[PDB]
Amino acid sequence: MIKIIIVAHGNFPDGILSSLELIAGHQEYVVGINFIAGMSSNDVRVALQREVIDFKEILVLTDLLGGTPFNVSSALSVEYTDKKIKVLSGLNLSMLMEAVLSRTMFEHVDDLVDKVITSSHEGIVDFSTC
Amino acid sequence: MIKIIIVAHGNFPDGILSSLELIAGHQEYVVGINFIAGMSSNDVRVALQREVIDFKEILVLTDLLGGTPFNVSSALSVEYTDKKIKVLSGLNLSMLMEAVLSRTMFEHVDDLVDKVITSSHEGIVDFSTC
Numbered sequence: 651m652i653k654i655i656i657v658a659h660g661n662f663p664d665g666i667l668s669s670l671e672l673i674a675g676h677q678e679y680v681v682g683i684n685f686i687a688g689m690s691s692n693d694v695r696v697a698l699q700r701e702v703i704d705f706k707e708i709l710v711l712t713d714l715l716g717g718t719p720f721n722v723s724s725a726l727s728v729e730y731t732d733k734k735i736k737v738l739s740g741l742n743l744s745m746l747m748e749a750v751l752s753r754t755m756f757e758h759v760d761d762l763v764d765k766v767i768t769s770s771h772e773g774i775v776d777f778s779t780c
Numbered sequence: 781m782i783k784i785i786i787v788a789h790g791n792f793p794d795g796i797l798s799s800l801e802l803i804a805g806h807q808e809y810v811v812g813i814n815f816i817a818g819m820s821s822n823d824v825r826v827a828l829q830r831e832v833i834d835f836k837e838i839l840v841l842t843d844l845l846g847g848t849p850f851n852v853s854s855a856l857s858v859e860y861t862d863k864k865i866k867v868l869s870g871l872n873l874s875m876l877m878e879a880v881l882s883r884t885m886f887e888h889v890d891d892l893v894d895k896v897i898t899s900s901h902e903g904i905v906d907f908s909t910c
Contacts, residue, residue: 658799658873659798659799659802659803659873660795660796660797660798660799660800660801660802661794661795661798662795662796662798662799662873663795664791664795665790665791665792665793665794665795665796665798666790666792666795666796667790668789668790668791668792668795668816669788669789669790669792669843669844670790671790672789672790672815672816672817673789685802686798686802687802713799713872713873714799714873714874714877714903715874715903715905720907723907724907727907736906736907736908737906737907737908738904738905738906738907739903739904739905739907740872740874740900740903740904740905741872741873742843742870742871742872742875742900742904743788743789743792743843743844743871744844744845744870745872745904747844763906763908767904767906770870770872770904771901771904773844773845773869773870774868774869774870774872774875774897774900774901775845775868775869775870776866776867776868776893776897777850777853777854777857777866777867777868777869778866
């Protein structure tokens, strides 16, 4: 059971989640934290802490390297002795679908992240390229 | 100008556009086509045609390889003799920010896509590796 948590600027999390819902329907243990206008770094931190209280294996998908979602997520990911918290930047729908569709193959998030990264890269394609 | 068109499942385009608005503010020549429940493939085609009527250099950012937004966009990109339409899949915020921040440097979308692709890939990072 790997919990997927999406953290990104604006309502990007709501938006990409609506893509997932249209394609695959509603999923268990998948949440979005919308980093909207008005909220601070700490607001994101509080929200994320809340979402991880009861989970050991957690994949956090964030929009942009070095942005507040990624920074807050990575800072928190090293604070829990027995939690496994992976934090990715570069979130595309490939990243999200792969995590959702493959996570049940894995007990541990450590063994899921390699395949999620591979699909994220493989999903970036220029149509000219055939 | 190089016009940027975002086509994706659900309200993903609105959501990622809200990320852009928050980070960079409102941009010219950047539109979203939300492929929501109830919409047909032709509906997407009609919308895209409308957005490209009066533009010669067009970058279309789509969510997912082999999906309706990508398929409709790719099919249309080869139908105009004198339009330059590039169609990418794998849309992440890195892809969008690069197109927006760098398009000014280029007359032609052809010379912009390689930088956009590079940044898209470079933006996918696992914090464990830093």
